[PDB]
Write a protein that binds this ligand. Structure first.
Ligand SMILES: *[C@@H]1O[C@H](CO)[C@@H](O[C@@H]2O[C@H](CO)[C@@H](O)[C@H](O)[C@H]2NC(C)=O)[C@H](O)[C@H]1NC(C)=O
Ligand SMILES: *[C@@H]1O[C@H](CO)[C@@H](O[C@@H]2O[C@H](CO)[C@@H](O)[C@H](O)[C@H]2NC(C)=O)[C@H](O)[C@H]1NC(C)=O
Ligand SMILES: *[C@@H]1O[C@H](CO)[C@@H](O[C@@H]2O[C@H](CO)[C@@H](O)[C@H](O)[C@H]2NC(C)=O)[C@H](O)[C@H]1NC(C)=O
Ligand SMILES: *[C@@H]1O[C@H](CO)[C@@H](O[C@@H]2O[C@H](CO)[C@@H](O)[C@H](O)[C@H]2NC(C)=O)[C@H](O)[C@H]1NC(C)=O
Ligand SMILES: *[C@@H]1O[C@H](CO)[C@@H](O)[C@H](O)[C@H]1NC(C)=O
Ligand SMILES: *[C@@H]1O[C@H](CO)[C@@H](O)[C@H](O)[C@H]1NC(C)=O
Ligand SMILES: *[C@@H]1O[C@H](CO)[C@@H](O)[C@H](O)[C@H]1NC(C)=O
Ligand SMILES: *[C@@H]1O[C@H](CO)[C@@H](O)[C@H](O)[C@H]1NC(C)=O
Ligand SMILES: *[C@@H]1O[C@H](CO)[C@@H](O)[C@H](O)[C@H]1NC(C)=O
Ligand SMILES: *[C@@H]1O[C@H](CO)[C@@H](O)[C@H](O)[C@H]1NC(C)=O
Ligand SMILES: *[C@@H]1O[C@H](CO)[C@@H](O)[C@H](O)[C@H]1NC(C)=O
Ligand SMILES: *[C@@H]1O[C@H](CO)[C@@H](O)[C@H](O)[C@H]1NC(C)=O
Ligand SMILES: [Ca+2]
Ligand SMILES: [Ca+2]
Lengths: 575, 575
């Protein structure tokens, strides 16, 4: 008898950017009270977890953040009581809530830093201070290290008369995780939010926690370049400021703090991490070891990087994640996020449905960014008098609920960001009346994913794939039924499935289709037609399963194998 | 009720260089059968653990080693049966046996390497192979990395037509610990020796297990130096070939393999490591974490580095180890070893006794190198027709047992190394007849250390120290007795102890003294005389202990605090 799937394994996650979900008090900024009013809509999506990005008291709301108090709410989002009412409303709905945590830096207005730049007490080495020659407005940094946004990562502080370190903007001084006073502070921040009932954290920017103690220069990517023109982050090799040797042991103490709150059954606290962008073998380290426990999964954002809808492009993201993942770990598929271009603008409107069908039929936890379920798109321009990253700001446009003032988001006259011009046709109210929309298909896949027992605990055998088409099967032993997903990223195709499967009848029934005209229509596997961005979930009966054979041992995947008993009507792991 | 001390915590360790202990078959090389004949002498020293350095089948017996078979014995030392008879003899004596393990490299005659240089099967990537331009006997290495003994660490292999990596000599190709086939091989070597009854391992050269995958050049210590004259290891910064990010996780899997054999009580398997030479904060990482288990202790060889007998020199080694050590860990004190100059030649013959008294009264496990108990010294010259390191060879001279042929070591005409000329006066037989010798005092400290309950579980308060004198106290709460160790590394001293302690009577009795004339003589703490290399263990009665006060909270140390009950007659941890 195998162990039940945890709540973070069983249902999709829904990532919300709280300043753009729903506005309650007519001021143009979303708030925690507005998320509580729309909890009913989240349960129609069969969502399991709500993931709210940062809402702490912040002096900078971008550039990975500048938090002035890790135990407070920013005023625009509400108060501490408004958050406690939201958590009670989320739990009584049967949902879970995970929140963003960034432990790397603070704001230069944090009380810890105003005490540190004065050498007040034990706060003197909460940050990384160093002597640097400064005069006439010019400073000589202790080394050639560059900030992620590009300039010397050392900044002179006139009060302390030294230089402090920052990986990000100068408003974001880096905390010193080599001393144990700072790790006790972060330990107390975790315990404060886990006490309020938060079901887990998403830790971001963990690869920047530690830097080399010797403070030696980095090696330039171009060896023969004049050292005074090195100002771009991509012009250096980052061997001393990223993923130092003691970094994963700090992450493991975060996990051990969260184990104190995850003992009682039903209240396991989730831990997730932002993946290393340029390396997938460094990402799989966060999965932990057979004897050392770490993150529950690192968030896989490699599907949200693709800017060309190709068959070989998607196929490569899938196999590379499942090949490198440790043996019995849980995959996850994130097709969009706050800092990448929305799916409709990146790939095209004809690919919205095919992409919802992909992440819901792959093995693991599908993670959904708000607006992706209705085919939302990037806004073309904005006018913001606040410090934001204009390269990534346009995917945070307010949610489109109906055809009304500000797409039914604010009920005021102004919103912090403009809504898309096509909210008259693309909105939640309109899409849930028409029979086959982007929102309707999402609700059919979310419901299918919930109660199938074949998509949640079934094997995954990835069949061959020419470009422009992806095929794979989900199957469990004692079920006598398999799902066959055919996804066509090409211009068209009329392909023969009897050649490819060799385990398929001549008449199979269509369980679901993105075009949605094939409601329950049967098809003949001799000649199946796929119209350039269409996907089918075929369902039929068979005994000879694909993973039993020796030809497919290499391309079948399962997290924890468990056969099914038609007699006893239970999963059992002995098989 | 606190947990009992393990066998590696309770008694001293005795390090034996097996080729120089005792020769059985007249061939001039010590063997495992010769160690079994002298087990009686090891129990007169009250030794708990025997530590035998490497004896595997080796093509190179120095330069950290070149092993041709990790599951065989070198012929000069005996056979597999001779080892099984030695382990049975060691256990039936009540002793433990730990052995050396080096997992970094092999010999170029290993079967794994003769299969790897031919690309035979899965052995093709057991080692680190790379393409390099070779012609006319000259080779262009893949980067500027240097071997520890100084030259390019890449060597061209004519059969494979590539370059292989070696941190040490070219006869020692480095294993590839990034693939899992090699870590399964080392896992099976550990299980093979733990099955034979070996009670633990000493892992050496663990900081060299991993190297950077990118193979980028190191940074020169002298930035403006011509790159073709960089041939010394000390001319580079070793950021890519030493202590890479995944190294401690490989050590932790070694520990987890040894936990399968350490479950039954009385048979815990010890794990020790060779310390990082130039850094003490990197050494304390091997102690592990509160939640991740690693080495039981890293071997502290900082006492064996001192080449000047100074009071401030010894005092600095002691405080730096106890300050940086994690909270409840076990210290260890190694005053000599196979690769450093013996204690008599490094400091002087007048400092042999004072150094035995130091490591036996400090808190932790004292580790003894064979010959140190009788005041052995380095030989002046040798004539070896084998590849050895002449800089460190002279501390491996054969053990001096009596005034006979070859100091009673071989019973043959030749020995692999000559014995010291002064074996007529310095030998075990002579020293155990005269009343107060180096061997006699060692047996009194070893016996005192065994059954005292104050030196094994007592606090350690390090009192003030002018140069030329070291004072410290060992005390437990419910015992009503304290030991006061006065060690004089200066030229002479007549010091007043009533000024320094303020808890001491005017008449205290001498428990032990290196000069040994003070057998049971009482002394007056008004004027105590110490003759330039003398040490006293003073013993008296008091109630107001030194660690109870607030002035000494900073300079008292204990591994696991536990008071003593005069009524119940047990240690209890609630105090
Ligand atoms: C580093 O910081 C400076 C701070 O001013 C940035 O400034 C640019 O400076 C050049 C001339 O020195 C101007 O032509 C640019 O207009 C400045 N930038 C802006 C946005 O006004 C500089 O860009 C930074 N280096 C980076 C980001 O690589
Ligand atoms: C690395 O940088 C050097 C110098 O910046 C580049 O070499 C050329 O140097 C001359 C100097 O007189 C410049 O006029 C050229 O513009 C430089 N070339 C380029 C492409 O910038 C060298 O090419 C750089 N290496 C690269 C770009 O790989
Ligand atoms: C690197 O390896 C070479 C291999 O020969 C070592 O050789 C020395 O070479 C110089 C001239 O090239 C001779 O004068 C020396 O006598 C050679 N050494 C010996 C021991 O004979 C060289 O020393 C090595 N580099 C080191 C060890 O730093
Ligand atoms: C680093 O190396 C350079 C060059 O090897 C040293 O600079 C001097 O360079 C001239 C070149 O004409 C030599 O004649 C001198 O002998 C070099 N000086 C020395 C001390 O070797 C530079 O000094 C070195 N840096 C050090 C040793 O810190
Ligand atoms: C700055 O320093 C002064 C004196 O050094 C101190 O009185 C003041 O409280 C400090 N400011 C802060 C914000 O700690
Ligand atoms: C003052 O600033 C100028 C900038 O042109 C600089 O060259 C000079 O060294 C500075 N001198 C002092 C004393 O700060
Ligand atoms: C949507 O809103 C517009 C303006 O508010 C209105 O004219 C239109 O009738 C609405 N749509 C429907 C279906 O009622
Ligand atoms: C919003 O602004 C409009 C004019 O811009 C004004 O007529 C209206 O009263 C405002 N609404 C609120 C709630 O203040
Ligand atoms: C060397 O290679 C040949 C053929 O490639 C093979 O027959 C031989 O066994 C190899 N030698 C060793 C020691 O494996
Ligand atoms: C041969 O060796 C000489 C060494 O003087 C070298 O200069 C030359 O490049 C080499 N040529 C070939 C073809 O190996
Ligand atoms: C030690 O050995 C020498 C030579 O074997 C011998 O002359 C001497 O008497 C021995 N010492 C004692 C105390 O017997
Ligand atoms: C040792 O060598 C000597 C001469 O060097 C010889 O007389 C003696 O017999 C040898 N001993 C043995 C055991 O071979
Ligand atoms: Ca940092
Ligand atoms: Ca290695």
């Amino acid at each position: 008898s195998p162990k039940c799937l945890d709540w973070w394994q069983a249902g999709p996650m829904y990532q919300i950017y709280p300043r753009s979900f729903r506005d309650s008090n007519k001021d143009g900024d979303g708030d925690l009270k507005g998320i509580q009013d729309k909890l009913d809509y989240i349960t129609t999506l069969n969502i399991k977890t709500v993931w709210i990005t940062s809402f702490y008291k912040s002096s900078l709301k971008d550039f990975r953040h500048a938090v002035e108090d890790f135990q407070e709410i920013d005023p625009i989002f509400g108060t501490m009581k408004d958050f406690e009412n939201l958590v009670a409303a989320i739990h009584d709905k049967g949902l879970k809530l995970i929140i963003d945590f960034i432990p790397n830096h603070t704001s230069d207005k944090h009380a810890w830093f105003q005490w540190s730049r004065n050498r007040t007490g034990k706060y003197t080495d909460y940050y990384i201070w160093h002597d640097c020659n400064y005069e006439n407005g010019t400073t000589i940094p202790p080394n050639n290290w560059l900030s992620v946004y590009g300039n010397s990562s050392w900044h002179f502080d006139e009060v302390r008369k030294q230089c402090y370190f920052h990986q990000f903007m100068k408003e974001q001084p880096d905390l010193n995780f080599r001393n144990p006073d700072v790790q006790e502070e972060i330990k107390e921040i975790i315990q404060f939010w886990l006490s309020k009932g938060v079901d887990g954290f998403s830790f971001n920017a963990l690869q920047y926690l530690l830097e080399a103690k010797h403070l030696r220069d980095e090696a330039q990517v171009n060896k023969t370049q004049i050292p005074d023109t090195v100002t771009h982050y991509s012009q250096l090799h980052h061997d001393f400021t990223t993923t130092q040797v003691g970094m994963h042991d700090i992450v493991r103490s975060f996990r051990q703090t969260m184990n104190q709150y995850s003992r009682e059954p039903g209240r396991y606290r989730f831990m997730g991490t932002e993946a290393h962008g340029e390396s997938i073998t460094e990402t799989m380290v966060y999965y932990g070891l057979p004897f050392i426990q770490e993150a529950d999964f690192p968030f896989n954002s490699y599907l949200s990087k693709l800017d060309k809808p190709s068959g070989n492009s998607v196929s490569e993201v899938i196999t590379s994640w499942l090949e490198n993942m440790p043996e019995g770990k849980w995959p996850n598929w994130m097709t969009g996020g706050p800092d990448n271009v929305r799916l409709t603008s990146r790939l095209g409107e004809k690919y919205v449905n095919i992409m919802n069908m992909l992440v819901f039929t792959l093995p693991g936890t599908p993670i959904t960014y708000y607006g992706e379920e209705i085919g939302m798109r990037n806004i073309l321009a904005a006018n913001l008098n606040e410090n934001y990253d204009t390269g990534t700001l346009f995917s945070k446009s307010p949610m489109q609920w109906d055809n009304s003032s500000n797409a039914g988001f604010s009920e005021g006259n102004h919103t912090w960001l403009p809504t898309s011009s096509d909210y008259h046709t693309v909105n939640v109210d309109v899409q849930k009346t028409q029979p086959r929309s982007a929102l309707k298909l999402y609700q059919e896949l979310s419901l299918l994913h919930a109660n199938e027992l074949l998509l949640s605990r079934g094997w995954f055998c990835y069949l061959r794939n020419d470009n422009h088409s992806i095929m794979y099967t989900r199957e469990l032993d004692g079920i006598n039924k398999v799902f066959l997903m055919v996804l066509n990223f090409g211009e068209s195709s009329l392909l023969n499935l009897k050649e490819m499967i060799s385990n398929i009848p001549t008449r199979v029934r269509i369980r679901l289709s993105t075009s949605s005209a094939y409601s329950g229509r049967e098809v003949d596997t001799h000649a199946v037609t796929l119209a350039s961005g269409e996907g089918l979930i075929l369902e039929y009966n068979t005994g000879n399963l694909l993973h039993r054979q020796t030809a497919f041992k290499d391309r079948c995947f399962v997290s924890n194998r468990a056969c099914y008993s038609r007699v006893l009507n239970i999963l059992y792991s002995l098989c």
